[PDB]
Assembly symmetry: C3
Homo-oligomer: 388 residues x 3
Amino acid sequence: NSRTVLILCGDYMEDYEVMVPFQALQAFGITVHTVCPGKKAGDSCPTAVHDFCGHQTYFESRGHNFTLNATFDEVDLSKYDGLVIPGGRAPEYLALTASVVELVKEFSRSGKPIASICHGQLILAAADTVNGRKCTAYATVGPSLVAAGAKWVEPITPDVCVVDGSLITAATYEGHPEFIQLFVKALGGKITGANKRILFLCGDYMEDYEVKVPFQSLQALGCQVDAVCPEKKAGDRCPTAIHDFEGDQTYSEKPGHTFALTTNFDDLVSSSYDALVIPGGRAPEYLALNEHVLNIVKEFMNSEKPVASICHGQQILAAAGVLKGRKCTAYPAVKLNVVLGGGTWLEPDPIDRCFTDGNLVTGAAWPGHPEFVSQLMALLGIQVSFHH
Amino acid sequence: NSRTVLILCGDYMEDYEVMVPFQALQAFGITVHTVCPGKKAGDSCPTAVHDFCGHQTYFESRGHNFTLNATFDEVDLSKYDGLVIPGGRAPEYLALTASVVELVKEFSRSGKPIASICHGQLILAAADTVNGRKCTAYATVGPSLVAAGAKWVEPITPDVCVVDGSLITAATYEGHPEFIQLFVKALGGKITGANKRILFLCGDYMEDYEVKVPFQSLQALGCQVDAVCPEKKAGDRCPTAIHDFEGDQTYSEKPGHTFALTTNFDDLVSSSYDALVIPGGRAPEYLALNEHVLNIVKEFMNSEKPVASICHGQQILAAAGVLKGRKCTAYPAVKLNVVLGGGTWLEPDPIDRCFTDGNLVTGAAWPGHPEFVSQLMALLGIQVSF
Amino acid sequence: NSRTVLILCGDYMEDYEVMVPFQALQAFGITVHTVCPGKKAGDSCPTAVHDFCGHQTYFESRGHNFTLNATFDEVDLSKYDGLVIPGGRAPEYLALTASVVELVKEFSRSGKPIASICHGQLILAAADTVNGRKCTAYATVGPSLVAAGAKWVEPITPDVCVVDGSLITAATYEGHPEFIQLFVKALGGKITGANKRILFLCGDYMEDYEVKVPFQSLQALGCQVDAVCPEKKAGDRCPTAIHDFEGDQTYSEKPGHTFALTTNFDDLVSSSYDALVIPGGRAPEYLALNEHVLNIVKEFMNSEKPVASICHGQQILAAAGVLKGRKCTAYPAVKLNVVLGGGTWLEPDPIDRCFTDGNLVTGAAWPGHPEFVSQLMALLGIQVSFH
């Protein structure tokens, strides 16, 4: 609305590092444009899934293909208030692209906020814009930054964020919450009403974006967000599924990042939470069989606390019988579940559209995260205002 | 002949759930047509491999591409005696396809047999054809079926099957045997001579379809079928290979479903078995080096008991020396092993054809399962009559 | 020139089995041409990665696409001194290709050296060229070779090699060193000065080709080569990455073969080695943060011992501060690290070109292995000559 941000994309950029800020910022009322040198709006970029399993370094597999909404060659920097540089393997080649270094230098020269994460900083080193600047980055980027005159800050923990003037840097996607918050503040944003506790009902193979994006978006606002899964405790990990449309009549599926739970399902007081969020994917169909899970849903629905479910997440609500006389959307196929549950179907067209029915916010698929998070924020009374 | 069945296919339907019934029913003498809305005969559908690693739910990877043989838009329900609905991720979107719902609704009201498995039942719930009907399905489909008025039967075991009038249902592909048997009976079929015991020589990376289809087709008839692998015991698993042609000069390979052995190889006694079956893939080349395996083959051959080998499986027969002066086919490349083994080659043209030379049934690749199984049935005196 | 060799390729041939000899032989001064029936120079063949991961047989995934540099239908056998037959799944179908069988029969008849490995021998059986010939092969090929009249040598271990006159055979890529050495000898080649010890700085996700090709090429010469990785001991393995360009703005990545370390990093005495090699991939970026790794590099540089680094390997050199005032190339993107490191950039054009600056040999990507190994051989004083 009152702010416009540009995201510098590239092939094999880290999937979370482009999508989380892309949708979170939009959810907060910021217009976001994505560009990649040599590509135009509508074109796609493959992404990389960099997971920290158990090797001496991260493992890589392919993530969701990312569709650009802007044309690099037609970029007018005077129209942008901030720049975001995702990590992944795109930075190393983007850093050697003349037009890219030029763009970053021009932006850095203006004093406008630049949020760079993980390997994204390689581009700042190439643009020679870190001399004497305090900054962190993925640990392996340290040598290059030091060589470029930076006041390097070794990331002691994966969530470390550093700030120098309007230059905001992070080491990994685990720092997204503070990373994004600092960027929003840098853009003159003021966050209010974020003192809330949110519970996420997770499970094996929930959709990769659908758990991470809303989870980190809410944490970025300052909310306390917990993730639980039956039979699993804090620290345990849940594998995720990347659902993407690649030309066939339905989506394809491949592994996403493993997601770490934060709270024990057993020791869980639902009355201690202000809202419930249900990621989509394949976890909902089996979680819907867990009576304890259904009880939690019924409680929030009865207490009339905000409940946000997306895509297949609605399968749990239907099983809980809390959809009778309620209006909501869901993944197209899930219409069966909604209608069978006694609910009123709302057509998810466009696919990124979300709906609010009293305390219930529903989305259809990951493209709808901006409205999903935005509408949940409205119900929780959380606001981001650009008045500073 | 005598019976014609329609299989409601879709993108990412479970690979075993479409291929096992497609080939088993054909082996039994039933004409089977496969269709997918929006696609025509000759088009292909990607399939999903759903394996249960004891995790909270299944893991998915891609299976063989499946080639449809009929056109959805040209379908005339009056021609079909029965309908089969595979599971996987196709059902959820097919259930929201108007043309599909209409087809299922009409078929249901016609009273003809419908065999739906795992997630396939979602389409039945969408077509509102299960009210008051007893049925099972993959556990997670229970809520939808209950909401649709079904008399839900919780699947207590992976192989649980239910038959209630014209409706036959199963929970997972592990229930294929009884699932298909019940469907055949519903079509008015009578299976005779199936009281036989068959041995499968398995190994790591045998072809995904080549072990599962023949194995479950024979179980569907009512045969007791055992699977063994040297150095492994009952309960142990063997990874499998999915071989598909995707444009290059030879086939590609990716992971298939893990296959569970049922018997200990060391306690095995050939005299107890009526027939021997050898799946193809990459297991045969190393199994052919095991003298115990070669000894087993020699015993069956000398007893003149039925021996059915497909695709690369013939490498074991060649090494055993039992192809000397015998006629057979195999995977095209395996002609080398056959001829060097002293055998006479029979060209597999078309590729889905099989041959029998006395007690020896041979096939060339997975498309040949229908004739592979039907010819083994002939040697065993097993028949399906309508 | 001096010697020219033809490599019989096919779809899904084993990646190591085609690339190692292709690049090692070139490093040794041999002109190598690669062909596949039905394909022309410039066309590519998919390759297979066959890994032995504890199953009763090997596991397979897809490797790098291999680009042929010759046209099968235009092959003039009189121009070739030797023939190499890679293994994998290509041999089974190549063996049923009439044109291929005709080619092999004629070459075998000429009496020229033929080096066949693993499953490649299936083609020899089909060509009926093993009767009375002593040979080994992947164990599963034994029955067919015996049936074909071969004097079969069951491989007691994966590295077993056999030579019977003009026929050189191996069972798996683990036998590449002796396999290639024997073939070079068969071509009338002589190796001198190979009594050297080489140390490889390995790590998780290092590039599959960049570790295996130089490692086995050096072993083929007769060198004692060891590989180490921090926190790992001999016998432990490192997963590798296969980097290939498939149409996007940067390379793709998928799993390669797992690579076995041969010595304990923690008990290492680098001073006992004559040269150091640094494979590329994603290992260098994290290895560059290990002071122990940096110390090994500094030791070799200070002693002015031969150091060969390729592609991203140079990230370690930059972090060790040993590129100040030195001339070198690296993976294009790594130019950033090199320049920031204080070095003089040498453009990698063509991409298979390598450069030598005193004791430092640098390459930019796996296509440069021939010059990479050849220039390291020069610093080490290792020569390969043909009568």
